[PDB]
Design an enzyme around this catalytic site. Structure first.
Site, short mmCIF file in Angstrom:
data_model
loop_
_atom_site.label_atom_id
_atom_site.label_comp_id
_atom_site.label_asym_id
_atom_site.label_seq_id
_atom_site.Cartn_x
_atom_site.Cartn_y
_atom_site.Cartn_z
CD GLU A 92 -2.87 -1.26 0.16
OE1 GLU A 92 -3.66 -0.29 0.04
OE2 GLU A 92 -2.90 -2.25 -0.60
CG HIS A 136 -12.26 -9.46 -12.50
ND1 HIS A 136 -12.13 -10.34 -11.44
CD2 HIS A 136 -11.51 -8.38 -12.18
CE1 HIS A 136 -11.34 -9.81 -10.53
NE2 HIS A 136 -10.94 -8.63 -10.95
#
Ligand SMILES: *[C@@H]1O[C@H](CO)[C@@H](O[C@@H]2O[C@H](CO)[C@@H](O[C@@H]3O[C@H](CO)[C@@H](O)[C@H](O)[C@@H]3O)[C@H](O)[C@H]2NC(C)=O)[C@H](O)[C@H]1NC(C)=O
Ligand SMILES: *[C@@H]1O[C@H](CO)[C@@H](O[C@@H]2O[C@H](CO)[C@@H](O[C@@H]3O[C@H](CO)[C@@H](O)[C@H](O)[C@@H]3O)[C@H](O)[C@H]2NC(C)=O)[C@H](O)[C@H]1NC(C)=O
Ligand SMILES: *[C@@H]1O[C@H](CO)[C@@H](O[C@@H]2O[C@H](CO)[C@@H](O)[C@H](O)[C@H]2NC(C)=O)[C@H](O)[C@H]1NC(C)=O
Ligand SMILES: *[C@@H]1O[C@H](CO)[C@@H](O)[C@H](O)[C@H]1NC(C)=O
Ligand SMILES: *[C@@H]1O[C@H](CO)[C@@H](O)[C@H](O)[C@H]1NC(C)=O
Ligand SMILES: *[C@@H]1O[C@H](CO)[C@@H](O)[C@H](O)[C@H]1NC(C)=O
Ligand SMILES: *[C@@H]1O[C@H](CO)[C@@H](O)[C@H](O)[C@H]1NC(C)=O
Ligand SMILES: *[C@@H]1O[C@H](CO)[C@@H](O)[C@H](O)[C@H]1NC(C)=O
Ligand SMILES: [Zn+2]
Lengths: 184, 596
Positions: B357, B487
């Site tokens: 991150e 997806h």
């Protein structure tokens, strides 16, 4: 001497309508503002302050700006940019001091300080010490213009200062003490 | 009086409007994400509606300037981004139908549950539920039951919707002067203009085919080793030369093979590296983990976190008083606002997620000086690759020993390296064929080479030929297997992961070579190497202002996708597999099926 009204006011003016504050008829005591207001920016392009006792000022001007964070570098002689070209232009032979300080605690709001404006479009360049208040719409095309809509755009746009902005976007109260030594 | 000046003024106005509108929307979204409350939802909805209305209004006015009369190669990209008719080319009723069909598909996927037979009062969702069965069960009939069920209940409620979705999307794509919707997605890699760096939309297929033609031997050896090892856990369910069943891959769809480590470990006696006990014994907290990550990032010469990041970003779960969504995410609210939203625990996994991150945040912070429309990655694959290179580099035993989290007398052997390499391979190498095959099937469906009645006849046919997996039960045209994925049911691209995986190892090889590293690639740490960071910076600050080929060439030295670094990273594992499976057979035949 009045420096309290010049430095400790609740509201200042927008950069497009910068107040040319008049300072006159008093004794220069701004050393308290050294300690009361920790000026992080202090740039003097003219004479040294130590020489200020040899020549004093009577008809000296002062300027009050409210601008963004990554803009204090643009307020310098020989600089270029949006604000330098359209809003406030300093001459090459500029004898004065730029002072700036952060104003998150008193010039930012959760909703947004929609009270400070700045020029964006103009069909010319500025000259040293010029002020414009015009509000006529800006033309961009060949056709004559009446009102907004097509390419014509309004000449003014406001800021969106918030207390949780980054260091480069927080409002800086910038006293560009462009105090003219040659005129006083 | 020309067109270029008018376009410049138009972009100048748009740049200042979009900043304020986007900042308001992002702040509302973050405020909603912190809590769970009705008024936050109301504010988020209002802000999103206002932003969408402004964007739609500004899109219309941008078509007045022809694209052929402007030669600047910088404002042209922004105008091309703005001049795009989104979904307004069709009539209003067709657009309403498309929005309805997308919402129906999303709702059907989100709230799907399956019930055990003869027990209507016991039904399990996908998460938790079927995922736990798929990831932590050694039984055979239960895995097959769940795998067949989930698809049986979900895909048949999505296939008729998907047919109309495809038809309408093709109509819109042809109305937008394209070939099909697959061409519409391939256009993200399209580069036109400056000579020497052109990339046509059709070059991507050839590049992917050529690059995948070289990975086959390593995947073949890994597949053979996995098949040989799994014959000990399922003695009478795996063919000696056949393909691996898809319901025994440790996942619902087979995207990753990570959950098979406990079955295929080479040396089970020697333990792996886990510093959780060292973390606990020294009274470590989330703040310490984050400051260690910041120290690692500054060790290579990159800047560190702004003060506001230490104030506005939450680091630990507030508790029962509030209710947040624990999911790591790097937030770039604009105007100098960068935040991290993650519920942190004392664990090595969080120790690596923090690095991932923070790499995200660093990449976001790199290109803050570019205009608003160009504030993104070079393509859809650079971002996670830049995130993951740090995570790979920060887990080396040398770094752990240097920071004091491991015993200095721990003699690293040449036996644990094989374990680490196999664990990395099972999650990196084993996902490329799946992504490649899914994207190839989707492109073939969109193009029109596959008629409506021959979809599944190809879908299971490609698997046997590429991934080496075989369906356990036969399927007819009623099923829609790919739509079971997140997806596919929701409109999302899938070629991002292949490019990201190929880019990350190439970047790692380039940085390790620039860091004067001696030895195998898997033992490389970019720490204490300024030359390994500055080079990366040359790509970080470009953003979308330059073609991705030039950005890739600025670091690696080549302007095309390459695969040699990936195979170089796994060289000792490749040698060990070659030595181990000398008495077995490599390759698979597409004739054996479990049901016939
Ligand atoms: C395509 O358009 C972009 C702008 O949309 C052009 O980039 C701009 O190029 C000018 C130079 O012509 C840059 O001006 C700068 O002025 C300062 C003033 O002191 C000077 O010190 C700098 O060295 C520079 O000349 C301007 O910053 C730059 N802006 C951007 C956003 O890139 C570009 O040149 C155009 N393409 C071609 C081929 O001309
Ligand atoms: C999608 O974008 C295209 C431009 O890329 C838009 O095309 C433009 O649509 C307008 C209105 O239909 C056309 O104006 C009309 O053109 C005809 C023929 O020249 C003329 O006789 C009419 O008096 C009127 O001016 C315009 O020519 C056309 N331009 C191009 C380049 O195609 C299209 O409207 C967009 N679709 C949307 C927003 O749904
Ligand atoms: C990166 O360099 C630093 C600085 O040399 C290393 O930290 C030193 O580690 C040695 C271990 O023998 C200590 O004696 C020093 O006291 C440490 N430096 C300071 C300033 O305390 C660090 O270990 C290096 N990192 C890696 C991964 O090699
Ligand atoms: C500035 O204003 C504040 C608030 O009224 C006051 O407390 C402070 O003493 C003032 N300082 C000066 C410059 O007089
Ligand atoms: C400028 O400042 C002076 C002195 O404080 C004040 O009297 C005047 O009203 C101001 N004018 C404007 C235009 O703000
Ligand atoms: C979050 O919720 C708490 C109580 O539920 C409330 O006091 C607080 O103001 C909320 N904050 C935001 C940003 O919604
Ligand atoms: C790294 O973080 C430390 C901690 O505040 C700071 O002193 C230092 O300036 C940072 N390094 C860089 C390059 O910004
Ligand atoms: C490790 O080194 C030893 C050296 O004695 C060698 O026998 C062995 O084959 C090497 N590889 C493994 C996996 O142990
Ligand atoms: Zn990521």
């Amino acid at each position: 001497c009045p420096f309290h009204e010049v430095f400790n006011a609740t509201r200042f003016a927008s950069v497009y309508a910068w107040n040319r504050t008049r300072i006159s008829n008093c004794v220069a005591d701004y050393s308290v503002l050294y300690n009361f207001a920790p000026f992080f920016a202090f740039k003097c392009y003219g004479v040294s302050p130590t020489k200020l006792n040899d020549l004093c000022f009577t008809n000296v001007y002062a300027d009050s700006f409210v601008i963004k964070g990554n803009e204090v570098s643009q307020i310098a002689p020989g600089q270029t940019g949006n604000i330098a070209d359209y809003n406030y232009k300093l001459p090459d032979d500029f004898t004065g001091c730029v002072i700036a300080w952060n104003s998150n605690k008193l010039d930012s709001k959760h909703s947004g300080n929609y009270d400070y404006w700045y020029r964006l479009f103009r069909k010319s360049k500025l000259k040293p010490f010029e002020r414009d208040i015009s509000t006529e719409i800006y033309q961009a095309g060949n056709k004559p213009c009446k009102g907004k809509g097509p390419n014509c755009y309004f000449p003014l746009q406001s800021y969106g200062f918030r207390p949780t902005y980054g260091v480069g976007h927080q409002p800086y109260r910038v006293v560009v003490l462009s105090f003219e030594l040659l005129h006083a | 009086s020309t067109i270029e000046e008018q376009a410049k003024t138009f972009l100048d106005k748009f740049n200042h409007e979009a900043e304020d509108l986007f900042y308001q929307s992002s702040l509302a979204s973050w405020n909603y994400n912190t809590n769970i409350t009705e008024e936050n939802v109301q504010n988020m909805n209002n802000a999103g509606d206002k932003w969408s209305a402004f964007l739609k209004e500004q899109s219309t006015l941008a078509q007045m300037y022809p694209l052929q009369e402007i030669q600047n190669l910088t404002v042209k990209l922004q105008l091309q981004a703005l001049q795009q008719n989104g979904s307004s080319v069709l009539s209003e009723d067709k657009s309403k139908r498309l929005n309805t069909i997308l919402n129906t598909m999303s709702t059907i996927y989100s709230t799907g549950k399956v019930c055990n037979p003869d027990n209507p009062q016991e039904c399990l969702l996908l998460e938790p539920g079927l995922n736990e069965i798929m990831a932590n069960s050694l039984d055979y009939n239960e895995r097959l039951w769940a795998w067949e069920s989930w698809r049986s209940e979900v895909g048949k409620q999505l296939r008729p919707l998907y047919e109309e979705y495809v038809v309408l999307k093709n109509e819109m794509a042809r109305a937008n002067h394209y070939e099909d919707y697959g061409d519409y997605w391939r256009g993200d890699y399209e580069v036109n203009g400056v000579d020497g760096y052109d990339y046509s939309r059709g070059q991507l297929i050839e590049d992917v085919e050529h690059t995948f033609e070289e990975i086959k031997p390593l995947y073949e050896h890994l597949h053979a080793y996995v098949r040989a090892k799994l014959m000990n856990a399922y003695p009478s369910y795996i063919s000696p030369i056949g393909c691996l069943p898809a319901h025994l891959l440790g996942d619902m769809w087979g995207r990753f093979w990570t959950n098979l480590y406990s079955l295929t470990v080479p040396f089970g006696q020697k333990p792996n590296i886990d510093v959780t006990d060292a973390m606990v014994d020294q009274a470590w907290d989330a703040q310490r983990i984050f400051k260690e990550a910041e120290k690692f990032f500054v060790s290579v010469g990159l800047p560190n976190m702004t003060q506001g990041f230490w104030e506005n970003s939450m680091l630990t779960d507030p508790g029962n008083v509030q209710k947040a969504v624990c999911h790591p995410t790097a937030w770039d609210l604009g105007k100098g606002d960068f935040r991290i939203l993650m519920c942190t625990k004392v664990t090595m996994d969080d120790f690596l997620t923090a690095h991932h991150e923070m790499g995200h945040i660093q990449y976001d912070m790199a290109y803050a000086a570019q205009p608003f429309l160009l504030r993104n990655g070079a393509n859809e694959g650079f971002h996670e690759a830049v995130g993951e290179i740090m995570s790979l580099s920060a887990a080396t035993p040398k770094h752990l020993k240097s920071i004091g989290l491991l015993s200095p007398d721990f003699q690293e052997d040449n036996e644990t390296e094989i374990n680490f390499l196999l664990k990395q391979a099972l999650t990196i190498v084993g996902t490329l064929p799946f992504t490649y095959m899914l994207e190839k099937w989707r492109w073939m469906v969109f193009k029109g080479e596959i008629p409506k009645d021959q979809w599944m006849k190809k879908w299971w046919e490609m698997k046997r030929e590429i991934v080496g997996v075989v369906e356990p039960v036969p399927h007819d045209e009623t099923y829609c297997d790919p739509a079971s994925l997140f997806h596919v049911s929701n409109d999302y691209s899938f070629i991002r992961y292949y490019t990201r995986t190929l880019y990350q190892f190439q970047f790692q090889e380039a940085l390790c070579q620039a860091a004067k590293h001696e030895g195998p690639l898997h033992k490389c740490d970019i720490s204490n190497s300024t030359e390994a960071g500055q080079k990366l910076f040359n790509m970080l600050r470009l953003g979308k202002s330059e073609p991705w080929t030039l950005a890739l060439e600025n670091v690696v030295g080549a302007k095309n996708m390459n695969v040699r670094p990936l195979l170089n990273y796994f060289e000792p594992l490749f040698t060990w597999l070659k030595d181990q499976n000398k008495n077995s057979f490599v390759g698979w035949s597409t004739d054996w099926s479990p049901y016939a």
